[PDB]
Design a protein around this ligand. Structure first.
Ligand SMILES: *[C@@H]1O[C@H](CO)[C@@H](O)[C@H](O)[C@H]1NC(C)=O
Ligand SMILES: *[C@@H]1O[C@H](CO)[C@@H](O)[C@H](O)[C@H]1NC(C)=O
Lengths: 380, 380
């Protein structure tokens, strides 16, 4: 059961992105950007030629970047101009799905940097160092589906989830998680000087009854006491989708200990995925290995629960820990027209119909649902 | 729509096998064997300790073999004793699904030959030659799902469809078709003297919308003018099944021309899968290759139509060409409780409910459905 109150726009404005910046909702739409907070929907127009606003990251001010008519360009929050004139790798050249995260002041994104569009995963210039980019064909043309930053004890690391499409005898999709060192310095050489030197990846695995799911929809890493737990949502070309959970501690341990797939010899002293003390640069042997064989000979198996299967075609999902109990969540996952909630404790799924073209669910303290009608806020 | 008239037994007798011998239905049940012809249901008791009758092949007389209490033993049709005392590889040691075909006088079967039960595909002693068996781990523990004999222009060849379960990093099922020379003489050596020397296999492929099906249920090869067409029915751990069709001419061409997967060098003069003139024996080099790399570097892609998708859990399927048109069939596929027909021309699927625990559909001139209640015969 769910009662949602609707703060709608004046018109049905095609949603293009939704972000949470310090419990303030930033809904990038065509034309303006909407700002939800305290049930207050402040719309701010920027331009309207094409200008699909897609990015609303926060570095120092929450700058907001869009694509004004095939030219990507940023702004300050209130339509003002960006001092640093950011905007190349911050917004796509055309309306697309993006993945752009911002740590302290360090923007990482998969957004296309040029017009042609070779897919790469980049960290842009800032406190971490100069720009970086993954070698080609590493990131699939579909893009990076999830990205989040997590401590590795002492060094920040960036994790990204994507779905590769291998094609040898038949096309097989494979879900991957990939780790990189947030403060990587680049490779050793001059050509490989702006390339990640700590990029590694493992296959995930979400099997239930011999049906293995392989297409990532969306991810979210909740931070708990002993470690953080990663919730992935897989879709399938069949009529099903499946939420799995993985223990980031198990993943980190696997990254640090497992062996590189296809590489049989002894791994060098600064082990490939390992972060390095500030200013250090990966040697050449380690880098040659880490670029040739960048996949561990392993497979991350999910936690025991909650694995569950919902409909096919879910688009978003967000978690909200129940205030009464603890480590028991309500996972609100959203389809084009129908809300669904799932309680990790009772393992029952509730549903609800809503006559709108939903786009996302965000959760700050109460699930707010971003649909083309406008925003809604939910109370059961 | 379908009206079926029911010739039922006196009791609900657990069906264990059904065969068509010259348009006579032979229904092996627990205890007796039933014989349907001209709407006449002649039951013939043989023994009743355990005696799950499973085989009703025809060599010279249609002998019928069962498993009398963990001892496999054959009989003549009318309960009489077998002169040659056949019965080892003709009936399983316990109730199981079997695959046993009979060409002219040459019984081929995957039935377990001993108590332990290593799965192999065997040709038994008779006009073709002495017994033969496939090397171990070639046939999956699930068994061989379909088998039929087809000319290769001049030499008879045996084709078998099974589903391998490869397990390297995750478990993947792979459907395979495999060809052997019916009059193979065995390998060259003394150890490999009763092993097939002409065994090869390719992957099939039944993909529809990026969903690839890999679990074979049942096969049937219809013989047409220019060639024969192979109808395979795949199941999936998801909620779907798919019928595909393959052109045996394409398969034969692929077997004769394609290259052995993993073998990069030049194939020897008596090409591996190639039948040999009577009395000839495969050389040693050809045999070493054919045993090491017995899979072609290829994949058989289905015909254009009819590919279709029906429910998950279908158990049988049989074809009946429409009397009016030609090359247009009615495919009756049967589920545990529900009949389904599918017309290749109209591409519409009809269904029908029947309150019985169906076991199979046979088609002689009118589809007769073998359920535990008894036999039924259908007219639309
Ligand atoms: C929304 O706009 C009104 C209009 O001035 C302003 O008073 C209010 O502070 C704004 N709130 C936010 C969260 O921007
Ligand atoms: C069925 O049994 C009857 C009983 O004698 C016999 O006359 C008839 O020929 C049998 N038919 C077949 C097909 O066995």
């Amino acid at each position: 059961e769910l009662e949602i109150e609707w703060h709608k726009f004046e018109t049905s404005e095609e949603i293009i992105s939704t972000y949470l910046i310090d419990d303030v909702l930033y809904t990038g739409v065509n034309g303006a950007v909407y700002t939800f907070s305290n049930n207050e929907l402040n719309k701010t127009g920027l331009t309207n030629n094409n200008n699909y606003i897609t990015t609303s990251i926060k570095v120092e001010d929450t700058l907001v970047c869009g694509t004004n008519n095939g030219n990507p360009k940023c702004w300050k929050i209130d339509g003002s101009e960006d001092p640093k004139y950011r905007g190349r790798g911050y917004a796509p050249y055309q309306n697309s799905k993006v993945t752009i995260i911002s740590h302290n002041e360090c923007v990482l994104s998969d957004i296309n940097i040029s017009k042609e569009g070779i897919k790469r995963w980049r960290r842009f210039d800032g406190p971490c160092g100069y720009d970086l980019y993954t070698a080609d064909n590493v990131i699939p043309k579909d893009g990076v589906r999830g990205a989040f930053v997590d401590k590795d004890g002492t060094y920040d690391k960036v994790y990204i989830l994507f779905t590769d499409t291998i094609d040898t005898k038949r096309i097989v999709k494979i879900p991957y998680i990939a780790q990189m060192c947030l403060n990587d310095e680049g490779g050793p050489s001059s050509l490989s000087s702006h390339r990640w030197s700590t990029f590694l990846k493992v296959e995930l695995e979400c099997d239930i009854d011999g049906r293995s799911y392989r297409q990532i929809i969306h991810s979210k890493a909740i931070k708990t006491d002993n470690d953080t737990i990663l919730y992935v949502f897989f879709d399938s070309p069949y009529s099903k989708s499946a939420l799995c959970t993985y223990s980031m501690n198990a993943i980190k341990h696997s990254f640090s200990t497992s062996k590189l797939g296809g590489y049989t010899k002894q791994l060098p002293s600064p082990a490939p995925g390992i972060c390095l003390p500030a200013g250090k640069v990966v040697p050449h042997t380690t880098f040659d290995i880490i670029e040739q064989y960048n996949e561990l000979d392993d497979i991350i198996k999910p936690l025991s629960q909650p694995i569950f299967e919902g409909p096919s075609g879910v688009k978003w999902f967000d978690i909200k820990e129940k205030e009464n109990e603890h480590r028991e969540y309500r996972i609100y996952f959203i389809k084009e027209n129908t809300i669904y909630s799932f309680d990790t404790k009772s393992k029952q799924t509730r549903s609800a119909q809503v006559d709108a073209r939903l786009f996302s669910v965000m959760v700050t303290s109460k699930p707010l649902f971003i649909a083309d009608i406008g925003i809604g806020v939910g109370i059961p």
